[PDB]
A and B are shown apart, each in its own frame.
Chain A
Amino acid sequence: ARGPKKHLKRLAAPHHWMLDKLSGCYAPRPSAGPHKLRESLPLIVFLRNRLKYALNGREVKAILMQRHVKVDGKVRTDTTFPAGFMDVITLEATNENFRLVYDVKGRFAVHRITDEEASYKLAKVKKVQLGKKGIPYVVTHDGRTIRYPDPNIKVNDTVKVDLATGTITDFIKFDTGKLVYVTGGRNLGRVGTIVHRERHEGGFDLVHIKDSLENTFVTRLNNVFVIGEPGRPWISLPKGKGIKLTISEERDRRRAQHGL
């Protein structure tokens, strides 16, 4: 009761942050923004714990003030901005570009993108609604609203964005026999080609999905995210390529793959 809550205890924080149990009572609450509390990833975790440049949160505040971080083009000097899925993080010093794509386990991966391709962002829909003066405007699932779309763009259809200028480039339709990423639940950070869709009467849609190894799995509709034609990825993907392996298969690889 009584207003909002402006704290987060460390055990109560979500697990895919990969914070320590010891060496701290609290965890960094990500502020309000285009991504939700669970699905986001704050910049304290990215700089301190992932890249491992800064030793503690003190030194993250020094880097932001002078002054090369650029989430989706613009700067952001906030320590806990909710940076999430398909967001581009660049650095002019070191010439490094990144993208927050999910790992086969479910964690956020440190994926080094080309200069170059870090330039367009991929987002989803959402609405699909008219404003005043009969103006059609589209909304992105990952934050923004964009104006004047193509007449044939509908729900669950992905859209490419210019990032620097902020306009529509291209779109893909949600149909059978196309690549699709998963961003929610147990089958998180997997890629597949789609087969069937059970529509249902006001009780959540489902999708049956294969992969290159011919292994079937089922997921909800809202977790699903389109990613181009089959065997034709629009975005560069990390090693693994959303296959997901057995326990005993991964044991076979590590002890075999040796070379000091």
Chain B
Amino acid sequence: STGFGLVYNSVADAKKFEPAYRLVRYGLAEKVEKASRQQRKQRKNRGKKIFGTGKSIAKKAARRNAD
């Protein structure tokens, strides 16, 4: 077989330059848990809808119940 090896100088140098997924497999850095591609795309659209912040519209929610 024929690999493709990279021998860095030190540990602090090899941590930053190498891609994140390569650090996971050997067990150097932590695995970055993130949200699914669908739901965070929905969050972008729903965040855009309300001009915002959530304070002003939430205070109206109490007033809208009386109507």
Contacts and interface: CB of A to CB of B under 8 A. Distances in A.
B26 interface: no
Nearest to B17: A62
A243 B16 CA distance: 48
Q: How large is the interface on B (under 10, 10 to 19, 20 to 34, 35 or more residues)?
A: under 10
A58 B20 CA distance: 13
Nearest to B4: A55
B2 to A, nearest CB: 16
Nearest to A59: B17
Interface string B9-25: 00000000101000000
Contacts of B19: 58
Contacts of B17: 59, 62
Contacts of A59: 17
Nearest to A58: B19
Interface string A46-61: 0000000000001100
A59 B18 CA distance: 9
A81 to B, nearest CB: 23
A63 to B, nearest CB: 10
Interface in A169-206: none
Nearest to B16: A62
A168 B39 CA distance: 62
Interface in A55-74: 58-59, 62
Interface in A14-69: 58-59, 62
A76 to B, nearest CB: 21
B52 to A, nearest CB: 33
A62 B17 CA distance: 8
Interface in B18-48: 19
A94 to B, nearest CB: 15
Nearest to B6: A55
Nearest to B19: A58
Contacts of A58: 19
Contacts of A62: 17
Interface string A118-129: 000000000000
B53 to A, nearest CB: 36
Interface string B48-64: 00000000000000000
A62 B13 CA distance: 12
A145 to B, nearest CB: 40
A59 B17 CA distance: 8
A47 to B, nearest CB: 15
A58 B22 CA distance: 15
A65 to B, nearest CB: 11
A58 B17 CA distance: 10
A62 B19 CA distance: 12
B4 to A, nearest CB: 9
B16 to A, nearest CB: 9
Interface of A: 58-59, 62
3 contacts: A58-B19, A59-B17, A62-B17
Question: Which 3 pairs show the lowest CB-CB distances between chains A and B?
Answer: A62-B17, A59-B17, A58-B19
